[PDB]
Amino acid sequence: KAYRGGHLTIRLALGGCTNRPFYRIVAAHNKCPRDGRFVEQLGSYDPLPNSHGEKLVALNLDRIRHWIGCGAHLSKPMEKLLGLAGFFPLHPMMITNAERLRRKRAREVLLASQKTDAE
Amino acid sequence: PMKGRFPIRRTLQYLSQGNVVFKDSVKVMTVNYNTHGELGEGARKFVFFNIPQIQYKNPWVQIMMFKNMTPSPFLRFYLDSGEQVLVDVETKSNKEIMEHIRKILGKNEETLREEEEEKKQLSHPANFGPRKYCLRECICEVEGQVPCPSLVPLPKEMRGKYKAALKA
Amino acid sequence: KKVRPRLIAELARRVRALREQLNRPRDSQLYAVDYETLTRPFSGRRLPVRAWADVRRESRLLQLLGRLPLFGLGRLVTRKSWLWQHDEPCYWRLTRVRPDYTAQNLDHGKAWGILTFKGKTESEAREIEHVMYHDWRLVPKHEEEAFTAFTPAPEDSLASVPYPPLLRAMIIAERQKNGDTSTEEPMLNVQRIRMEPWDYPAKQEDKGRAKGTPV
Amino acid sequence: VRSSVHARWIVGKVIGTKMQKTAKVRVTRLVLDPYLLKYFNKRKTYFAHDALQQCTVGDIVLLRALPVPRAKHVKHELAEIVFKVGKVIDPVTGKPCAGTTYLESPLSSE
Amino acid sequence: ATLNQMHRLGPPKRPPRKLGPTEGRPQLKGVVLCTFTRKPKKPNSANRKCCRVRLSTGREAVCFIPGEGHTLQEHQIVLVEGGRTQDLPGVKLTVVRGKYDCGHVQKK
Amino acid sequence: ELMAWNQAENRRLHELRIARLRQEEREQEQRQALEQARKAEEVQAWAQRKE
RNA sequence: AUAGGUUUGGUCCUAGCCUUUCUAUUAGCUCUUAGUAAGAUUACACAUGCAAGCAUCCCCGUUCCAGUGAGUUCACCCUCUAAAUCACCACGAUCAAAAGGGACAAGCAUCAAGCACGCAGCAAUGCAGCUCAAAACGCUUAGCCUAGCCACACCCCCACGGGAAACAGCAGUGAUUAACCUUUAGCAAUAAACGAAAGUUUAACUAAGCUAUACUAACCCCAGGGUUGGUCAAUUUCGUGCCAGCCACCGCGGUCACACG
RNA sequence: CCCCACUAUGCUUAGCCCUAAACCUCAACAGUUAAAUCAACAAAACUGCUCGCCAGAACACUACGAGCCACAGCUUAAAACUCAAAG
RNA sequence: ACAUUUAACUAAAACCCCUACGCAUUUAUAUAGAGGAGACAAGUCGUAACAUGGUAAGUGUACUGGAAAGUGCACUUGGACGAACC
Numbered sequence A: 001k002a003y004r005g006g007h008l009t010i011r012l013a014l015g016g017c018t019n020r021p022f023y024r025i026v027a028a029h030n031k032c033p034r035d036g037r038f039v040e041q042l043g044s045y046d047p048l049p050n051s052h053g054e055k056l057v058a059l060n061l062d063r064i065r066h067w068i069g070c071g072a073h074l075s076k077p078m079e080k081l082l083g084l085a086g087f088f089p090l091h092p093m094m095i096t097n098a099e100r101l102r103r104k105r106a107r108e109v110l111l112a113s114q115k116t117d118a119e
Numbered sequence B: 001p002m003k004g005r006f007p008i009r010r011t012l013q014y015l016s017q018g019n020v021v022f023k024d025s026v027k028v029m030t031v032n033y034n035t036h037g038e039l040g041e042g043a044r045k046f047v048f049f050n051i052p053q054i055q056y057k058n059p060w061v062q063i064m065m066f067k068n069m070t071p072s073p074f075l076r077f078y079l080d081s082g083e084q085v086l087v088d089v090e091t092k093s094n095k096e097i098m099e100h101i102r103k104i105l106g107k108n109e110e111t112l113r114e115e116e117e118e119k120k121q122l123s124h125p126a127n128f129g130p131r132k133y134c135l136r137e138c139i140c141e142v143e144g145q146v147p148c149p150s151l152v153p154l155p156k157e158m159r160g161k162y163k164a165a166l167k168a
Numbered sequence C: 001k002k003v004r005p006r007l008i009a010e011l012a013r014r015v016r017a018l019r020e021q022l023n024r025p026r027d028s029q030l031y032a033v034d035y036e037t038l039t040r041p042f043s044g045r046r047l048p049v050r051a052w053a054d055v056r057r058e059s060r061l062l063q064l065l066g067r068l069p070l071f072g073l074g075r076l077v078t079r080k081s082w083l084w085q086h087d088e089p090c091y092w093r094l095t096r097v098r099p100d101y102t103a104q105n106l107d108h109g110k111a112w113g114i115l116t117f118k119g120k121t122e123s124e125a126r127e128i129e130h131v132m133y134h135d136w137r138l139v140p141k142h143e144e145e146a147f148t149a150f151t152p153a154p155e156d157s158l159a160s161v162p163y164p165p166l167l168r169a170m171i172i173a174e175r176q177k178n179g180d181t182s183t184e185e186p187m188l189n190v191q192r193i194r195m196e197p198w199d200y201p202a203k204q205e206d207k208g209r210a211k212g213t214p215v
Numbered sequence D: 001v002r003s004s005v006h007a008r009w010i011v012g013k014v015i016g017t018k019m020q021k022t023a024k025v026r027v028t029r030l031v032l033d034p035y036l037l038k039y040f041n042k043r044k045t046y047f048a049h050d051a052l053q054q055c056t057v058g059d060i061v062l063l064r065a066l067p068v069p070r071a072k073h074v075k076h077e078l079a080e081i082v083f084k085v086g087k088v089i090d091p092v093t094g095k096p097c098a099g100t101t102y103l104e105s106p107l108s109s110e
Numbered sequence E: 001a002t003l004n005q006m007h008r009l010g011p012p013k014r015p016p017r018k019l020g021p022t023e024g025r026p027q028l029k030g031v032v033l034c035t036f037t038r039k040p041k042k043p044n045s046a047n048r049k050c051c052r053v054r055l056s057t058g059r060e061a062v063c064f065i066p067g068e069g070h071t072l073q074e075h076q077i078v079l080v081e082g083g084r085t086q087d088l089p090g091v092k093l094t095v096v097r098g099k100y101d102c103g104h105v106q107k108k
Numbered sequence F: 001e002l003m004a005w006n007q008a009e010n011r012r013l014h015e016l017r018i019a020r021l022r023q024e025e026r027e028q029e030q031r032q033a034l035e036q037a038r039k040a041e042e043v044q045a046w047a048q049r050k051e
Numbered sequence G: 001a002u003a004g005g006u007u008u009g010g011u012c013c014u015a016g017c018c019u020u021u022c023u024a025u026u027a028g029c030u031c032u033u034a035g036u037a038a039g040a041u042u043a044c045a046c047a048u049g050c051a052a053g054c055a056u057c058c059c060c061g062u063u064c065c066a067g068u069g070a071g072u073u074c075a076c077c078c079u080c081u082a083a084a085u086c087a088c089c090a091c092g093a094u095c096a097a098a099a100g101g102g103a104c105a106a107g108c109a110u111c112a113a114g115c116a117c118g119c120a121g122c123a124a125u126g127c128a129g130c131u132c133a134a135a136a137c138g139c140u141u142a143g144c145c146u147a148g149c150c151a152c153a154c155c156c157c158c159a160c161g162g163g164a165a166a167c168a169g170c171a172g173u174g175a176u177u178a179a180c181c182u183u184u185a186g187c188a189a190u191a192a193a194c195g196a197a198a199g200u201u202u203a204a205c206u207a208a209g210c211u212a213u214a215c216u217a218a219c220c221c222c223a224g225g226g227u228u229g230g231u232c233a234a235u236u237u238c239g240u241g242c243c244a245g246c247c248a249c250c251g252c253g254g255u256c257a258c259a260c261g
Numbered sequence H: 001c002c003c004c005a006c007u008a009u010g011c012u013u014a015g016c017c018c019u020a021a022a023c024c025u026c027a028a029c030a031g032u033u034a035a036a037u038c039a040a041c042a043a044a045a046c047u048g049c050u051c052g053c054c055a056g057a058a059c060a061c062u063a064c065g066a067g068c069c070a071c072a073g074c075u076u077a078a079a080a081c082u083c084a085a086a087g
Numbered sequence I: 001a002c003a004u005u006u007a008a009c010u011a012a013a014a015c016c017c018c019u020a021c022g023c024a025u026u027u028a029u030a031u032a033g034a035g036g037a038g039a040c041a042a043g044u045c046g047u048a049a050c051a052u053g054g055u056a057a058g059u060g061u062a063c064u065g066g067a068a069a070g071u072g073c074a075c076u077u078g079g080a081c082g083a084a085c086c
């Protein structure tokens, strides 16, 4: 279909059942439905750990190069996946969130140590 | 029974046994054969048996046939570049004609093998989705993953009704 | 085979386009603002909260040029934004100004100028952006010299960055597989990539305009 | 070439010459009957531009797609009169023939 | 037919399936207009309880009332279904017992 | 090359034909003359009849 | 179809109608209770809540998504070449309209002719042709070839203007149907909006609530529906007496009914 | 139905009308008596090729529409209700 | 259906042919009244068919009859003619 404005975007297509998500790396349009038409499937992502405890992220890296070479954009969660993989640098906000967490957890030891001291 | 003489010619298996797949250059093939005359026996057998096989593997090439227009049976091919290729086929069996045109205007085995490889790449064994296009649909069809809540109900922990009862 | 011409569609199509030109809303109409509710009465929209103060504080571009001869052609004008956040002199050299004659105070309109960053003058003059923003601040003449003083900083910058983990591991094997034994650390050429500032003036020619209809 | 016209080369038979400098050509293509799996000839007419008006009704002609459609229905031109009605020259021997008989013996004038 | 004739004619198409008295509907809702008895065709002999109802499509039809004993009077809403009464020519609808006003047959 | 090979094949076949054509006519001519001679005899006899 | 029942006094051959199998919708009678998948009959009216904003003003989005199936060979290929995206006055790919060329539903020929539907010329003008029983031209039906696509968005094909205040967005209503979901949460997942960005909305979506519509798993307690003359698994004893009633087809019932209750 | 009488009509000419159990109910063309001939009966069973026709009964040599020198005509030709047979 | 401009030391303003229901037209639904078919199966009148069905049956056509039907002319066997001579 011809959309009135948009660009090829590499996104995650949400599959799976209720309380059982499973994502599909797909090269689609910036205006197509999330689970609608896509140009090419560039892998998958199991967001739940398997029997061996890992997250299974297949990536058709060869084709990802071609689609990015044609102007393919990337969604926020998709960028972060390529970071954790090592194909792209780590996402900036990813780091800032870890810091915020560690600064929250700094406060936490101050309060939790007190609890153990009392009882 | 099936109608007609030699009913095998009207079966897909017979139609898929053609070994002449013209190059992309061939556009029009004309067959000027004779209906009588012992010399043209091979020519008419080719039209009876093989033209069905040729047109099948080559659905876009215009095959045209003419009876008793010239004293001699002959083929002619019109290529896209504008070259035309008279193949005289008098006193030549239908199987010989079948191999002659394969030699001069048929794709080699290398070209066909290459095309077959393209189909292999279209169906990537890893791509998950409808079995009309893929092998597996979900990733819960892979051994040793998280199964689908349908067959085996997942632990209440994983279900968003009892972990929300722990949230609240 | 033939399709019935949608005639009324074409009629209204032309009619609408024409009527918009005839009823073009002026900058004084589009970019007016009520300083009590902080909402533009034309579209009844509330400006962002982080602009409330600045709006009531500073002044627009043609709010300053309104009282200057020929609207200050040839005068250098910078904006509060540049000043507050950046030290390097950033300014516009005005070349042409098309004021909005419909404004009661002639505080709206358009303006053209040539940007001169690090002594490089643009080949053409282009329209000034954010003309309706309450940022612009006129440079006093007597200190033009001090404001325009610029020292070319040393060009020492980064030239090449390392490849990310996976890509580096793959490039090597490619070299090795081919037969190249050179262990020269593969890197990039980020120097070529001119990292323009995020606040660099964009091309107003590509920016749209509000329609006559508020909706 | 950049021929916008779909059918680039087509052999047909002239069936009309009433239009001016335009011959109406019938072109038949074997189509597979999906049920009976037999090929029948499905025919369609094509307008061909014949500037010299050398086509007679009954000539088998070769049509080349025009780069751009000349008229509303004229997309091809007369590339060659393959077989002239009753004036066929044996394309294998080059000698004039009448049906299935060599009119002039090939041994008479070599 | 020959292959040329079988080609020229094509597929055998199909008679557009004629609708039934219920008009291709599982059931239909009618208003009892009258209740009477019609005697079956031979060799059978009885007095079968029918009723003329006005269906929700406007068309009025005779519907057989199954079971032993009905309490249907004019201007009552019944639900009718298909299934012809083989004994009664013309009758092709059947009142549903236990829906709307037509209640189930009494045990005794 | 394949087009040049085809033309050679057509040329080769042309030689076989042009020879065959000659041989058939040579034999036919003798048979034709005998048939024509027979005809002539019948016609001459019939002309005598009318005379 | 591995077939079966049914023409007759009987036998063969033809032949239609039914039977057996698998789904979906609706009803009757039942319906303990766990996951998951699905869920107006209606292109007919709506209570009047909620679903488009984000951004240091511009711009951008609100044209997408989500709906609906009323209309319907404009969906696929090819040729050209836009608008987007690829940081860029250079300019090549990707993607994809318009345009041009091919392709493309089902019935009815008791719809047989259509009526200008063609070509040439740079033009003024000449030609008189073009389609069609190998189905033109019509009429009636239909959303379609479901990684989805097409079309539609309150009627007038369109919408300048009229007719008039529009839920075919979510939840929900009296109507109308054989056709009986909650006037629940949340933006952390999630894709899509907005600035470079922290980020901020989203009835998309994600989680829930309902419904034996379907599929898995269940139990100490928790079995009802229909059938029982042949086809076709399976009736004892009584009432009834061609009555009352019963069959999908053959057919049962006339005081000794395995066919009815 | 039998007898007698007599007419349209049967004949000629010039135009119509276009129907028959117009049936030898058995198509044209090219062939075969070999096989397994071969439901019954009839005029033995068949092959190739093509065209024309048929697809339960009855409604129906009907109705509508259309054409036709035909105005009680002919040719084309359905549907609804009905049946579990007709043949 | 009309187009005719102002502006012009940065260059910009202005810039809209109007015409729609004859209950016309198209296809259906209802029908005063008139017919037809089918079913149903104890009425009435005859007995046309099935046997040489008591005048063989039927086809086309014409005319004629309460009703089946009768008669002409041609045609068909989906009748028969008894199968040595007599």
Ligand code: FES
Binding pocket: A016, A017, A020, B138, B139, B140, B141, B147, B148, B149
């Ligand atoms: S089919 Fe895999 S999650 Fe349900």
Ligand SMILES: [K+]
Binding pocket: none
């Ligand atoms: K009689």
Ligand SMILES: [Mg+2]
Binding pocket: I047, I048, I053
């Ligand atoms: Mg009698």
Ligand SMILES: [Mg+2]
Binding pocket: I053
């Ligand atoms: Mg009699």
Ligand SMILES: [Mg+2]
Binding pocket: I056, I057
């Ligand atoms: Mg008789």
